[PDB]
Amino acid sequence: IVYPDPSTTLSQSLSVAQVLSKLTLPDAFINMILSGGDSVVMRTYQTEADDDLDEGIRMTTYDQYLSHIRERLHITNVPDPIYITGASTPDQIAASVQATHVAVVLYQSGVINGSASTYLRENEVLVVMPDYYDVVSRFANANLQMNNNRYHESVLEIADIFDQADFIQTSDAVRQLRALMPTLSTSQIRHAIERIAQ
């Protein structure tokens, strides 16, 4: 009976395995310097006697939340954020954010008290609203800057809220690096993982 030599089949494996690693090597690197964070267009409502360009009462739509925040909140296994609803305690937001790791709370129905409304200013917990027709029907207030007749609207980041030591590259030295490039598309980044090949 003939018994085949182990060396000739063992050599084939370490060859097909070595080719695979250096194949996708440049592809995964650019997807690391990027992937830091992006998008999520939110507006911050400047409350008070206009002594701020950024107050802290920010909110986004339930629509924007369903395509950016929801998918990532399932990669990291967490209980979903509690609903503010109305007449909720100014520590229920705190009790949620504890086990959520990210500042976020869902919707508003019956106008909340001016005890929980203050809380949202410093902690930056953003409230996702299903509607956007009007917003100051759902807050009880001392009446300053509230009247919907403006709010400085800008953009947020996945780089700030949602930090994970892995999967979201969070180094501010590279955050400084990332804030220089001339706004990449899908074709600009494609030719980037192409010139790095040859």
Binding site: H101, A103, N123, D160, D163, A165
Partner: protein, 291 residues
């Protein structure tokens, strides 16, 4: 040829355990104040600790000299990936356990066969008791000897995060400990606590008597609660860092409950299967001596 006045080598400035953080260098006591914790409702109760087995392994004949000290730390708090270490020259210790031996244990962390010229070493009489307890760490991976890598950890969490109001009853609520951080954090304390001269501590535990043991345990219950914290993040299930406005917190999942694989991966220090048996053999051996 240093000697101890019963103050012990820890009552000395020759070697002192200091963490570096905050832009300057600080003592362990100052650090721990930052560790604030809450409760998550899974009762972590103190079990009993089974006594070790007297049989000492044999230091198989070895020419040259190994850095016995190196490995003790290079396994516990070793940061850089450490491969299998269940094997090794890890029991040359027992060659100091017998009465009249010439083999001496220097400073820095070596074990000489014959005392050589120009090398300062611990006192030959008080290094004997240290061996009749720690040379027993040689058989750490021998089947039917290894400790249990689950229950000791309950003992560990009641130490660095247990308010006395709790330990006096033997039961406490599982905690989730978060302090404020900087950049590398958890990995930086490891690269730091590694070079500490651990032998300068352990020798004192087995010698210093009730007079200077009650006083020793009071000034050093913190150098212990430091090399016990790092050794703990090598176990915890998660390391996710919460975000304030500009501040960053290093929430640690479940200190005091032992899982099987590191939360760090990349963020913190990591253990291995061969090391899980080792940490249980150390943690078990040391607690009886301490407590």
């Amino acid at each position: 040829m240093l000697q101890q006045p019963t103050g012990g080598y820890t009552t000395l400035e020759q070697f002192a355990f200091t963490i570096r953080n905050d832009g300057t260098n600080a003592t362990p006591t100052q650090f721990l104040q930052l560790l604030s914790y809450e409760a998550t409702e899974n009762e972590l109760v103190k079990k009993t600790i089974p006594t070790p087995e007297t049989h000492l392994p044999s230091a198989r004949n070895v020419p040259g000299n190994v850095y016995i000290e190196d490995a003790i730390t290079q396994a516990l708090f070793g940061i850089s990936a450490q491969n299998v270490n269940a094997h090794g020259y890890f029991s040359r210790l027992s060659a100091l356990a017998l009465p009249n031996t010439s083999a001496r244990l220097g400073l820095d962390g070596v074990i000489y066969n014959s005392e050589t010229i120009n090398i300062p070493f611990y006192d030959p009489a008080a290094v004997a008791n240290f061996a009749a307890t720690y040379a027993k760490l040689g058989n750490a991976s021998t089947p039917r000897y290894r400790a249990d890598m689950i229950d000791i950890y309950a003992h560990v969490g009641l130490e660095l995060a247990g308010t006395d109001a709790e330990r006096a009853a033997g039961v406490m609520p599982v905690k989730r400990a978060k302090f404020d951080s900087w950049e590398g954090s958890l990995i930086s304390l490891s690269r730091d606590v590694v070079n500490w001269k651990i032998l300068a501590f352990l020798i004192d535990l087995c010698s210093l008597e009730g007079e200077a043991l009650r006083a020793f345990k009071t000034r050093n219950r913190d150098v212990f609660r430091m090399m016990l914290f790092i050794m703990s993040t090598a176990v915890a299930a998660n390391v996710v860092n919460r975000k304030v406005t500009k501040r960053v917190d290093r929430v640690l999942e479940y200190i005091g409950v032992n899982s099987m694989r590191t939360a760090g991966r990349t963020a913190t220090i990591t253990y291995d299967l061969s090391r899980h048996e080792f940490a249980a053999k150390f943690l078990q051996l040391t607690f009886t001596r301490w407590n």
